[PDB]
Amino acid sequence: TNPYKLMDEAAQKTFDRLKNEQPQIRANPDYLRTIVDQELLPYVQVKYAGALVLGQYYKSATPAQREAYFAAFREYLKQAYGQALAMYHGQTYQIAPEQPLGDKTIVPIRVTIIDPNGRPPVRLDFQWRKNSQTGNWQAYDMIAEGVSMITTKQNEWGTLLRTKGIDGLTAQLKSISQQKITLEE
Ligand SMILES: CCCCCCCCCCCCCCCC(=O)OC[C@H](COP(=O)(O)OCCN)OC(=O)CCCCCCCCCCCCCCC
């Protein structure tokens, strides 16, 4: 279980479904949520990325609040990444070539989304951590062009956390995950 292979398998499998399952996506755009759930989330440290988004506000949550938060957060990943896969129009991808890992516990792995018409590339640095029990590698952030998504969400949900706490943020996640995914034509 090595992050460069996993990064590449996740990518291969996602692109395959996006190319070959247009009928399913067009019959029901929320079917993108499946492609995210089956091809991308198995490699995502969903609790850890959820907890990082909470920061200070993790310590204060009851187990009940945390489990309701994480459930909401996974639904919210499927919806949000689903809505991003709605931007597919026959892009291809490139992976950073494998480095040796040595003793490193964090590794950034770039996937360049490549436009078929030679429009500008999108550089996504996926952040992989070695799990400290199992040794397995999982993604826990995405740096889109220069910017951490996790930091982007800390900043954007910070008032909602100061005003309404985890419960407020869990209500907003559930709310967004109920938005039907929309397709460009
Ligand atoms: C590896 C396979 C990659 C798939 C790419 C397929 C190509 C399809 C074409 C579309 C181009 C892709 C880039 C879209 C532009 C963009 O980055 O934005 C896509 C959007 C940002 O946009 P927004 O303003 O809607 O944010 C507002 C949306 N709420 O991020 C998101 O979902 C944000 C969600 C991130 C939440 C916290 C971060 C958790 C990190 C966990 C890591 C998960 C994946 C790990 C997998 C191993």
Cα–Cα–Cα angle for 121, 122, 123, nearest 5°? 115
Q: Is 144 exposed, middle or buried (0-12, 13-18, 19+ CB in 10 A)?
A: middle
Helical ranges in 55-148 per DSSP H: 63-85
In angstroms, this model's resolution equals 2.5
**Measured between alpha carbons, how far is residue 42 from residues 34, 50, 64, 122, 135 in Å?**
12, 15, 23, 23, 15
Query: What atom of ligand 1 comes closest to residue 126's alpha carbon?
Result: 45
How many whole angstroms separate alpha carbon 53 and alpha carbon 136?
22
How many whole angstroms separate alpha carbon 14 and alpha carbon 48?
23
Q: Is 169 exposed, middle or buried (0-12, 13-18, 19+ CB in 10 A)?
A: buried
- Give the start-to-end residue ranges of the domains of the chain: 1-185
How many whole angstroms separate alpha carbon 41 and alpha carbon 44?
5
Please choose from 113, 178, 179 the residue to mutate so as to test ligand 1's pocket, defined by most ligand atoms within 8 A of CB: 113
Task: Please tell me the experimental approach by which this structure was elucidated.
Answer: X-ray
* Pocket lined around ligand 1, Cβ cut-off 6 Å: 10-11, 14, 40, 43-44, 49, 80-81, 84-85, 87-88, 91, 111, 113, 122, 126, 139, 141-142, 144, 149-150, 153
